Write a protein that binds this DNA or RNA. Structure first.
Length: 863
RNA sequence: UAGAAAGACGCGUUUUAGAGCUAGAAAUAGCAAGUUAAAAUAAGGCUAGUCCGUUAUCAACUUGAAAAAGUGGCACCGAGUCGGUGCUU
DNA sequence: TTGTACTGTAGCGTCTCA
DNA sequence: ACAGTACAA
C-alpha cells in the first residue's frame, strides 16, 4: 500500500525506481497493446530514461544575428541602388540587373555575362587599368576628372557593403596625421592610424587604398622574383608550387583553400635552403610577403576611414553629377548609420524579441530614424525588460547638493529616488538629459550638467507547459526537470493515483527544484528529500555494490534505487538488507532512449562545388546543384514507414514494396502539410494513407532471439541491447584497479588487494560471456575472432591492465553507436549497421516515458 | 564558473566575370598569368516588417483546428533482459 | 542492376552594451 | 551520420 520513488537527475539520464518498505522493487504484469501475439508482459518497477542533452540558445542567437546582419546589408545596397537608379537608367538600365545576375551561368543570365560593361573589350580594359577595386577607389579619390557612374557606384558599393567597425566614437579624419588637449587627441589619432595603416609617403585622402595598392605591387614584384629564382635554381618544384592546387603551394594559396600561415610554413623551408632570399625571409617574418587585400586582419579598420574616402569621392564628383550634390548627406548617412543597441529589431509587433516603440508609423529608414522612433521609450524598455522582479550616498550626494541638511530633506524625496533611478538605468548623455528634463526648474544649469555624469551601477535585491515555461535557468538543464515531472506523473498514474509517501531526488539549482516540485502538492492535485550524492557515494563503498560505468546503463536505475533506500533509511531513523543484494542483481531494467524528432539546421554548412551527384541540396530554388553546387549531409527529422507500389525496370512493373524513408527537416513542413502528395512526388504510387507510421530517431525494434536494434536514421541503426553481468564479476573488475587509493588503510584492507588473484578465472569466464552475448545480439564475427586472438596473445599480462582493457572491451557491447576502442595495443574498428531491411519485418516497440506501458506493432502483418 | 537578449565587424565557402599563348591528328608538353569584384550565406514564410525561420515542447490509442483532457488488476515463487501459477470481473 | 566493406568529411574569429 | 570508392552478386 506504500511505495517510494527514487530519482537520479542528470543532463542526459533520469533514473527511476519504485521501492516498498522492505526495499523490494515490485514486479507487475502489464497489458501490452498492438497486433502481436502477446497481451501481457512482466516487467520490474525500476528503470532509467535516456535522452540527448538539451541545447543552449547561443547558436540560434548567433545565427539569428547573422541573418539580421545580411538582411540589413542587402538593404543598404538596395537604398544605394534606389538612389542611383534614376540616373543610371539613362546609361545602363541593365547594370543592376547584371549585378544581381552575376551568379548565374552564361545560359541562365538574361543579359551579357560581363557585369560592369556588358562587352568583352571594355571589361578586359577595366581590369587591366584597375587590377583591384582599391586601384579604382584611389583613382576616384585622387583624380579630379569626370568618372563614369558605374565606376563610382562600384567604389561606393564596395565602401558601404564592407564599411568597417564602429569601435571609434569621434571623427578620426584620415588626413589628420600618420592646446595640449587637441595635440594629444591628434597624436592619439596618429597612434591608432599607425596601428591601422603602415606608411603613406605621398599625401592623399585615400591612405587605405594607397597602402593596399603598395601591398598589391609588392606581391606582384615578389611573385616575379620567386618565379625567376625558382626557375634559375629548382626547376623540378616549379610544377609543384605554381601549378598543383592540392600541395599547399602558391597555387594552393590562391586557387586552393590554403590560408596565409600554412602557405608561409610550407614555403619557409623552400626559401631557407635555396639562396638569395634574405629579403624574402625578413618579409615572411613580418607576415608581409605575398599578402592579399581581403584578409582576416582587416577587422581593425574603423568606418571613419571609409567614410572619409566616400566623402572625398563625392566632393570630387559633385559638380559633374549634381545629383550626388543633392543627396550627399544621404549616402554619408547610409555608411554612418547603425541601429542603436537599445532600440532592438525594428519590428511592428511581430517579433518575440523586439521591444521598440515608434511615433509615426512610416517605414523606418536611415534618414527618418530619429523622427519616427521613440528613443526614450525604446531605451527604457531595453533596460526594464531584463531586470528581475522581487522574489555611501550620504557622503556622496553631499558633493552635488553642497549641503548635508538638504540631503536630509524628507518631503520631496520621491523624485529624489527617481533621479537616482534614472542615472542607474540610463547611460547616453543626451538621453540621460532627456529623462532628467523633469527636474530642470529645481536647480541651476551647471549642477545638473555636472550631475548627469553621476553614473550608478548595481541593483539591490495553469497548464504544466506554461507552469514550467516561466521558470528561470538554461533551456539545456530544464530538460531533466520536464522529464522527471512527467515520470512522476506516470508513476502516480500507474498505481491508481496513490501518492507516494516519500520521493527521493539528487546545488542551488536543485535547491530550487525541491521547492518547484514541492509546489505540486497544492498546484497540480510526497515528502521530498534533498539527498546529497555523498551519502550514496560512501554507502556504495561501505558495501560490495561497486559500479563500473563503462559496462551498461543499468547503474542509473541502480543509483535511483540507492537514492530511495538511503532516503527512506535516513527518515526512518572548530529481511530488507537481505533483499537489496537480490535486487541489485536483477537482469531486467526498463531502459528507454527517448524517441525525439530532430530539429535544427538543414545540413552541414559547407557549400560543396558543382558535381554530377544527385545528393547535392539545391541551396536556392532556381540554383540547380548540378551547375551551382550546394549542401550535403541533410539532417533527417524522422523516418516514415511507407508501403506502396514502385515501378522498377526498363519494362516497368507495379511491384509492391515496404520500406522506410527519411524526412529531412525542411521537408517536414511540406510532408505534414500533405503526406500522400509529398510521397507521390518522391515516386511512390497508391500509398496506404492509414498504414503510414511515423518513426522518430531512437525508435526501438525488437528482432528474433531477443535482439533489439535502435533506429538512428532511415539508413542507419544502433545497438539496442544491454548485457548484465553478475555482481561478482563487477566486483572483481572494480577491485582489480585503483590500488593507490582503494584500501584507505594500509593493512586491514589487504584482502581487497588479494581478492583478484584468487578469482583470476572470472576474467576467462567473462570472455566467454562476451562472446556468447555477441553471438546473441551483436552478430559480429571477424571482430570477435580478432578480440579472441588478441586476448589469447596477451592473457598473461598483469591483472590491473588486463581488467582495465576488459573494461575497455565493453564498447563492443554498450548501448548506442559502435565505436573504436584500443583494448591493449590494437584498434578494434567498429562496424556500421547500414541495413534497415531487417527491421521492416521486426517488432516495433512504442515505450511509455517510464517504459512500463508498451505497444508492440508487428510490422510483418502490415502490407 | 556559467545563463538570456540587442547592435556590429572581418574572413571563409559557392557560381560567374577577370579573352591564356605556342607546338599540336591528339593524348598531352613547354611558356605566360595568379592578389580583385558581383551575388547568396540556412530552402523560404506571411501578419509584408530594414519582421520571422537551428532554443524549448514531442511513446501508442480515443476526443479536441489546436490548446487541452482521457485510455492499461492483484498476491506469490523464481530470474539470460523477464517466466509461470492462482484470485478477480 | 543492388547490396556490402573500407576510407574520408564535418564554419569561424573578434568585439560593444544593462 | 552521411558520402564516395571499390567490388560481390
Amino acid at each position: 500500500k506504500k511505495y517510494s520513488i527514487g530519482l537520479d537527475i542528470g543532463t542526459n539520464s533520469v533514473g527511476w525506481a519504485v521501492i516498498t518498505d522492505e526495499y523490494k522493487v515490485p514486479s507487475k504484469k502489464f497489458k501490452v497493446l498492438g497486433n502481436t501475439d502477446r497481451h501481457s508482459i512482466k516487467k520490474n518497477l525500476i528503470g532509467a530514461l535516456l535522452f540527448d542533452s538539451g541545447e543552449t540558445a547561443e547558436r540560434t542567437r548567433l545565427k539569428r544575428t547573422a541573418r539580421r546582419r545580411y538582411t540589413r546589408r542587402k538593404n543598404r545596397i538596395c537604398y544605394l541602388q534606389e538612389i542611383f537608379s534614376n540616373e543610371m537608367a539613362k546609361v545602363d538600365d541593365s547594370f543592376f540587373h547584371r549585378l544581381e545576375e552575376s551568379f548565374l551561368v552564361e545560359e541562365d543570365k538574361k543579359h551579357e555575362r560581363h557585369p560592369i560593361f556588358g562587352n568583352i573589350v571594355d571589361e578586359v580594359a577595366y581590369h587591366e587599368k584597375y587590377p583591384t577595386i582599391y586601384h579604382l577607389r584611389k583613382k576616384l579619390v585622387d583624380s579630379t576628372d569626370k568618372a563614369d557612374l558605374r565606376l563610382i557606384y562600384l567604389a561606393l558599393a564596395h565602401m558601404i557593403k564592407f564599411r568597417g567597425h564602429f569601435l571609434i566614437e569621434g571623427d578620426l579624419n584620415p588626413d589628420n596625421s600618420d592646446d595640449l588637449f587637441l595635440a594629444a587627441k591628434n597624436l592619439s589619432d596618429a597612434i591608432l592610424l599607425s596601428d591601422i595603416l603602415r606608411v603613406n609617403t605621398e599625401i592623399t585622402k585615400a591612405p587605405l587604398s594607397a597602402s593596399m595598392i603598395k601591398r598589391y605591387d609588392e606581391h606582384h614584384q615578389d611573385l616575379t622574383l620567386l618565379k625567376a629564382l625558382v626557375r634559375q635554381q629548382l626547376p623540378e618544384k616549379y610544377k609543384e608550387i605554381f601549378f598543383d592546387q592540392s600541395k599547399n603551394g602558391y597555387a594552393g594559396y590562391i586557387d586552393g583553400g590554403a590560408s596565409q600561415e600554412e602557405f608561409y610554413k610550407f614555403i619557409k623551408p623552400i626559401l631557407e635552403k635555396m639562396d638569395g632570399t634574405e629579403e624574402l625571409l625578413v618579409k615572411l617574418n613580418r607576415e608581409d610577403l605575398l599578402r592579399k587585400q581581403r584578409t582576416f586582419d582587416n577587422g581593425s579598420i574603423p568606418h571613419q576611414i571609409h567614410l572619409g574616402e566616400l566623402h572625398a569621392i563625392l566632393r570630387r564628383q559633385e559638380d559633374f553629377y549634381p545629383f550626388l550634390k543633392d543627396n550627399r548627406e544621404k549616402i554619408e548617412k547610409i555608411l554612418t548609420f547603425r541601429i542603436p543597441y537599445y532600440v532592438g529589431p525594428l519590428a511592428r509587433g511581430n517579433s518575440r524579441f523586439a521591444w521598440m516603440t515608434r511615433k509615426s508609423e512610416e517605414t523606418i529608414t536611415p534618414w527618418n530614424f530619429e523622427e519616427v522612433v521613440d528613443k526614450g521609450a525604446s531605451a527604457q524598455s531595453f533596460i526594464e525588460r531584463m531586470t528581475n522582479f522581487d522574489k555611501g550616498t550620504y557622503h556622496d550626494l553631499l558633493k552635488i547638493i553642497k549641503d548635508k541638511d538638504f540631503l536630509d530633506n524628507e518631503e520631496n524625496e520621491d523624485i529624489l529616488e527617481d533621479i537616482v533611478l534614472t542615472l542607474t538605468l540610463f547611460e547616453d548623455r543626451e538621453m540621460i538629459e532627456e529623462r532628467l528634463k523633469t527636474y530642470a526648474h529645481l536647480f541651476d544649469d551647471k549642477v545638473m550638467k555636472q550631475l548627469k555624469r553621476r553614473r550608478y551601477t548595481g541593483w539591490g535585491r495553469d497548464s504544466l507547459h506554461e507552469h514550467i515555461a516561466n521558470l528561470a535557468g538554461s533551456p539545456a538543464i530544464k530538460k531533466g526537470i520536464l522529464q522527471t515531472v512527467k515520470v512522476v506523473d506516470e508513476l502516480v498514474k500507474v498505481m491508481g493515483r496513490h501518492k507516494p509517501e516519500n520521493i527521493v531526488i539528487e546545488l542551488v539549482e536543485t535547491r530550487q527544484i525541491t521547492k518547484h516540485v514541492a509546489q505540486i502538492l497544492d498546484s497540480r492535485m510526497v515528502k521530498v528529500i534533498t539527498l546529497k550524492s555523498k551519502l550514496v557515494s560512501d554507502f556504495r563503498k561501505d558495501f560490495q555494490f561497486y559500479k563500473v560505468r563503462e559496462i551498461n546503463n543499468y547503474h542509473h536505475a541502480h543509483d535511483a534505487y540507492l537514492n530511495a533506500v538511503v532516503g527512506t533509511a535516513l527518515i526512518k531513523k572548530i529481511r530488507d538488507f537481505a533483499t537489496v543484494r537480490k535486487v541489485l542483481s536483477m537482469p531486467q531494467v526498463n531502459i528507454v532512449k527517448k524517441t525525439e524528432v530532430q530539429t535544427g539546421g538543414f545540413s552541414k554548412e559547407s557549400i560543396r562545388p558543382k558535381r554530377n551527384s544527385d545528393k547535392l541540396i539545391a541551396r536556392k530554388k532556381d540554383w540547380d546543384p548540378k551547375k551551382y553546387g550546394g549542401f550535403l549531409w541533410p539532417t533527417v527529422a524522422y523516418s516514415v514507414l511507407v508501403v506502396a507500389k514502385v515501378e522498377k525496370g526498363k519494362s516497368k512493373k507495379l511491384k509492391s514494396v515496404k520500406e522506410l524513408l527519411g524526412i529531412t527537416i525542411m521537408e517536414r513542413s511540406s510532408f505534414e502539410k500533405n503526406p500522400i502528395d509529398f510521397l507521390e512526388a518522391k515516386g511512390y504510387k497508391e500509398v496506404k494513407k492509414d498504414l503510414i507510421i511515423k518513426l522518430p530517431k531512437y525508435s526501438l525494434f525488437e528482432l528474433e532471439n531477443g535482439r533489439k536494434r535502435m533506429l538512428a536514421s532511415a539508413k542507419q541503426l544502433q545497438k539496442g541491447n544491454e548485457l548484465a553481468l553478475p555482481s561478482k564479476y563487477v566486483n572483481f573488475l572494480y577491485l582489480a584497479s585503483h590500488y593507490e587509493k582503494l584500501k584507505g588503510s594500509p593493512e586491514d584492507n589487504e584482502q581487497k588487494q588479494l581478492f583478484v588473484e584468487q578469482h583470476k578465472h572470472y576474467l576467462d569466464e567473462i570472455i566467454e560471456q562476451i562472446s556468447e552475448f555477441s553471438k546473441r545480439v551483436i552478430l559480429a564475427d571477424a571482430n570477435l575472432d580478432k578480440v579472441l586472438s588478441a586476448y589469447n596473445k596477451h592473457r598473461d599480462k598483469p591483472i590491473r591492465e588486463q581488467a582495465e582493457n576488459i573494461i575497455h572491451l565493453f564498447t563492443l557491447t554498450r548501448l548506442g553507436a559502435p565505436r573504436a576502442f584500443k583494448y591493449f595495443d590494437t584498434t578494434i574498428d567498429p562496424k556500421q549497421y547500414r541495413s534497415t531491411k531487417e527491421v521492416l519485418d521486426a517488432t516495433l516497440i512504442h515505450q511509455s516515458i517510464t517504459g512500463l506501458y508498451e505497444t508492440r506493432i508487428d510490422l510483418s502483418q502490415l502490407g
